[PDB]
Design a protein around this ligand. Structure first.
Ligand SMILES: [K+]
Ligand SMILES: [Mg+2]
Ligand SMILES: [Mg+2]
Ligand SMILES: [Mg+2]
Ligand SMILES: [Mg+2]
Ligand SMILES: [Mg+2]
Ligand SMILES: [Mg+2]
Ligand SMILES: [Mg+2]
Ligand SMILES: [Mg+2]
Ligand SMILES: [Mg+2]
Ligand SMILES: [Mg+2]
Ligand SMILES: [Mg+2]
Ligand SMILES: [Mg+2]
Ligand SMILES: [Mg+2]
Ligand SMILES: [Mg+2]
Ligand SMILES: [Mg+2]
Ligand SMILES: [Mg+2]
Ligand SMILES: [Mg+2]
Ligand SMILES: [Mg+2]
Ligand code: NA
Ligand code: NA
Ligand code: NA
Lengths: 158, 298, 175
RNA sequence: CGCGGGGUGGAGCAGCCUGAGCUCGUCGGGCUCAUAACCCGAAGAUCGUCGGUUCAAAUCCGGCCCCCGCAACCA
RNA sequence: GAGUACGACCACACUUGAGUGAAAACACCAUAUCCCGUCCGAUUUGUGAAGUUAAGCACUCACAGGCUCAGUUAGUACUGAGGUCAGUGAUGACUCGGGAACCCUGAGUGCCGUACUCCU
RNA sequence: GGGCGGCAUAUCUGUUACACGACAACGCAGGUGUCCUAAGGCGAGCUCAGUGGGAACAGAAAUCUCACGUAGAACACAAGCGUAAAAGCUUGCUUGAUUAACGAUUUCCAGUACGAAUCGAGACUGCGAAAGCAAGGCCAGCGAUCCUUUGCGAAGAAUA
RNA sequence: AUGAUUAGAGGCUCGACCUAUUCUCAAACUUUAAAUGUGCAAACAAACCGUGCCUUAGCCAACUGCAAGGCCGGAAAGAAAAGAAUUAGAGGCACCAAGUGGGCCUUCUUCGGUAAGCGGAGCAGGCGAUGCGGAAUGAACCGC
């Protein structure tokens, strides 16, 4: 019956998208990965070396070690009543730079720009208002909402 | 009739190759390995000595790869050799060696390490191991020369190919390109040895001179037969006994002033030649006109 | 105008001579010597792709010897083959790809001195017609497809045979 | 139903472990007045059926049509 | 407004026919003494420049096939939460939320880099 | 129930499995205790299965040739996945199927072993012009204590 | 696309073959693709700024570049505005041990079986261990 090999039950998980076959391109090779960066562990089924176990597919973690061909990623994994930090060794073709901190980095950079403008006397941008406030509405087209006889015939096929 | 392989389902499932693979320009399997380097280097600069030969010209470039696109650090062409005294044979082995020498001198000048790495002033056609971080050769403290790796694209890497002629020119100019002498002209595979004299002769164009001399005897023998081989050579009156000296002077001239190129005319708007695309509304109107014309006939 | 361009001149790309002995051994060796003498170049053997009981052939068994001839020797061999054929070919002998071919039953008729050892052999002549510029489909770098208008058609092949060899085409359907 | 074995020239039976044999029978000619016996010759398979693998299936692996056995126990 | 070399994305870039192509390129092309490789200088390698835009290549065209983005399909199919809801059941509707796909149809037919060159 | 049968007893692929991971049955469909000095490693060249047109014998089916051909072939096996200037085919050279300082880690999982894996570091190499690529044939093909048995601790140098 | 499947039509008296359709399907088929999910981040050992400094037997042809460990300063809506969280949120760390390791039921999902108060799973509740108030009566239903 069902067996428990390394790649058991990965028929759809470890497969290329339709019309998206092929080995990784130059952009992945030129990517710089540093210790401390956030990466997403996504297996590339066309490589088959350094390929992570199926559990770590689609997980995000912190790089703790970089080798000439490999990347060490720390991944949280719940076991029983605790969460373990598992250090998986993969090849660089199975890691992509994570954007989990993109919004926070933009928020920090926006704050520094606002602080610089305030300290330099530059006029601050206007503050967006709420769309949940009361107001007067002047309609341009008003229609009667009702159930018509033709609506019942329109839902009867054949 | 017969079954149509290239039907609609065939096109819907078809996956196109990379653009440069469809055009037959880039061996991406080799390109991936050339641009690959240890992840522990964290994207430190690495250069490819790109060598490409057309029917008329030799292109030698120092290329460093980026995600946005490759950057050409320095480029040299065999068509710029007339500025250094080579007016003929801009595709032979001698021109390949000079082009590699020209690229090496220009690159070292731009980096400011020329007059420190001078290479081999006199070409003897012999082999010497290049100094690279990989091979310490004793962990000496001398400054390592600028290093690039040879890229030959889809060219067949046979013994005596002009791509290795450009390689020999670049290394003699003071550049560090890892290589072994197995593909230099004059290398004997059975004896596993290099014949520096044969390599030097092809570097200075003796083979062209011997061939030019032999054709001139044939041309003298049969004047009534129109001669095409070396036609510009004879018309310019290039004696076979002056080719070696011409290339020697070219090497000295390249080393003396590498930045020299073909003279540029002192220079106007761009005259358009593109044919304007029709608009969708125009195309629908033309199709309707054809349909109406057929309707009028029927 | 465009068909009068000098690069559209139909030329003989190669002539392929094939002898299928189908048994391997001394007969194949003698056929190889006959072909080598005719073409003035060493031939290349062909092994059987499969095992067939009725033809007495086993897979990977050497069964045929063939050769490709180009240039002046190809034209000279073609004239010899057409002379044995009286410069008369059937319409169905011409493929839609512009090539044609015929067969010789005895190699003595090719002006070849018979030898009591080598014996007599029959051969297949196949001529591949083409134009300049077909290299773009066979080169390594930037290999592409030859334009549809540059191809040699069956009609042009028969016109070439009539005009350049004074040939006669019997319009017939193969039975 | 579970386990096992077997379908081969007209008959019985080998080969059943990839590249058809035995005896009898039948046909032709001899010997005899004739038949039998005897002597000289000849023909007869597509390996039960359907698929698969293999360059090649009586052969190897699957399902089917049948045939033949061993079991179907404790109450 | 273009070309060449290396390219990033890898069809809005592919496929099939048709037409057009300034300059410089690129390319066909000529050739086999030498380097080198083949049954064959076809491929490949070397050496060349008499010829051609005929092909490649580049642009444009097609109520073209695909492809890409939208609309439609449709608040439909399906679905998280709820009932001492309906129904003999099969199942269905309702309540608070989420919300597809094909067909069909509209528009589009590469884009962005480095270096050198043409127009100049 | 037990017996008979079978094996769901160690283990691999697809499905059951409900789009993370994980999940039962004597659920479903199939595999494993082998095989390979090449069927391992590397470089180069090449493109496969099939179609169509054409060529003495030659025919459905022998070989030659030219076009089309997104893989419809092939990769020792069962299956899934993956791969086209290859991961397939051919060939030239090879022994990276060696050694590897108790490095770290994944799968099972108690976060124990065992078996398979991943990323390294060092030695000596192979292939390649070079970037590089290899410490087997990706992922199934296997074994504790005790006992038996084999290899390594070469020669010579040190007043210790 | 891969498998399965019904029937006309058009091309090349039948048939075949090809072309575009048509009727109907898939746990071990899929271009597409939810709902519900699942991983990460959301400023106090952190991150951001400085032609700042020190060290390295690290990368790079070198370096003022890159990698790393620190030092000295700076700035900090302590996280604005836009629906822009909430908490009966004291976080972590050990030590020594018991009973249990026959389960059962139910809403939805779900496999074998004609089916079963039958066998077997998933998520979560419940009984077991628990009465009380209800459905006359009922371990599991309703309320609590
Ligand atoms: K003992
Ligand atoms: Mg699934
Ligand atoms: Mg998937
Ligand atoms: Mg290569
Ligand atoms: Mg011009
Ligand atoms: Mg040629
Ligand atoms: Mg053209
Ligand atoms: Mg034209
Ligand atoms: Mg269209
Ligand atoms: Mg789930
Ligand atoms: Mg799952
Ligand atoms: Mg390869
Ligand atoms: Mg350890
Ligand atoms: Mg293994
Ligand atoms: Mg294996
Ligand atoms: Mg392995
Ligand atoms: Mg999320
Ligand atoms: Mg706020
Ligand atoms: Mg009560
Ligand atoms: Na090593
Ligand atoms: Na043992
Ligand atoms: Na009840």
């Amino acid at each position: 019956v069902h067996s428990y090999g390394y790649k058991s039950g990965t028929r759809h998980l470890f497969a290329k998208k339709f019309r998206k076959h092929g080995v990784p391109s130059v952009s992945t090779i030129l990517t710089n990965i540093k210790v401390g960066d956030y990466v997403d562990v996504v297996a590339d089924s066309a490589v088959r070396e350094g390929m992570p176990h199926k559990y770590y597919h689609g997980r995000t973690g912190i790089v703790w070690n970089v080798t000439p061909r490999g990347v060490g990623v720390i991944i949280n994994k719940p076991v029983r009543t605790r969460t373990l930090r598992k250090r998986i060794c993969v090849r660089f073709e199975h890691v992509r730079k994570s954007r989990c901190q993109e919004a926070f980095k933009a928020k920090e950079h926006q704050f520094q720009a606002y602080l610089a403008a305030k300290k330099a006397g530059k006029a601050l941008p206007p503050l967006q208002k709420s769309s949940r406030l009361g107001g007067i509405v002047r309609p341009k087209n008003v229609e009667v909402l009702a159930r018509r006889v033709a609506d019942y015939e329109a839902m009867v096929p054949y | 009739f017969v079954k149509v392989v290239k039907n609609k389902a065939y096109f819907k499932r078809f996956q196109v190759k990379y653009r440069r693979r469809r055009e037959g320009k880039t061996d991406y399997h080799a390109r991936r390995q050339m641009v690959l380097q240890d992840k522990t280097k964290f994207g430190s600069p690495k250069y490819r000595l790109v060598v490409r030969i057309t029917n008329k010209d030799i292109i030698a470039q120092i290329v460093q790869a980026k995600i946005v696109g490759d950057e050409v650090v320095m480029a040299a062409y065999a068509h710029e050799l007339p500025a250094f005294g080579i007016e003929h044979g801009l595709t032979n082995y001698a021109a390949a060696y000079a082009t590699g020498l020209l690229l090496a001198r220009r690159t070292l000048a731009k980096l400011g390490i020329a007059d420190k790495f001078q290479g081999a002033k006199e070409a003897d056609g012999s082999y010497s191991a290049v100094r690279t971080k990989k091979d310490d050769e004793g962990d000496d403290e001398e400054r390592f020369p600028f290093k690039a790796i040879l890229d030959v694209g889809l060219a067949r890497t046979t013994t005596g190919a002009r791509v290795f002629g450009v390689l020999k020119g670049a290394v003699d100019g003071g550049m560090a390109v890892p290589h072994r002498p197995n593909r230099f002209p004059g290398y004997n595979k059975e004896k596993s040895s290099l014949d520096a004299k044969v390599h030097r002769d092809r570097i200075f164009g003796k083979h062209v001179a011997d061939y030019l001399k032999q054709v001139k005897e044939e041309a003298s023998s049969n004047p009534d037969e129109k001669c095409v081989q070396f036609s510009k050579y004879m018309a310019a009156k290039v004696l076979p006994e002056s080719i070696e000296g011409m290339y020697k002077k070219a090497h000295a001239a390249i080393r003396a002033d590498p930045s020299k190129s073909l003279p540029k005319k002192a220079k106007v708007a761009h005259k358009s030649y593109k044919t304007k695309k029709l608009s969708g509304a125009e195309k629908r109107a033309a199709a309707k006109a054809k349909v109406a014309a057929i309707r009028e006939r029927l | 105008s465009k068909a009068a361009n000098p690069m559209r001149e139909i030329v003989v790309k190669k002539l392929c001579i094939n002898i299928c002995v189908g048994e391997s051994g001394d007969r194949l060796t003698r056929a190889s010597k006959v072909l080598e003498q005719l073409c003035e170049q060493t031939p290349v053997l062909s092994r059987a792709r499969l095992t067939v009981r009725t033809f007495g052939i086993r897979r990977n068994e050497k069964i045929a010897v063939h050769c490709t001839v180009r240039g002046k020797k190809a034209e000279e061999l073609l004239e010899k083959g057409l002379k044995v054929k009286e410069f008369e070919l059937k319409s169905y002998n011409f493929a839609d790809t512009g090539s044609f071919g015929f067969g010789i039953d005895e190699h003595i008729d090719l002006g070849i001195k018979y030898d009591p050892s080598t014996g007599i052999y029959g051969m297949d002549f196949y001529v591949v017609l083409g134009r300049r510029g077909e290299r773009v489909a066979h080169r390594k770098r930037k290999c592409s497809r030859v334009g549809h208008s540059h191809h040699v058609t069956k009609e042009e092949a028969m016109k070439w045979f009539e005009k350049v060899h004074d040939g006669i085409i019997f319009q017939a359907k193969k039975k």
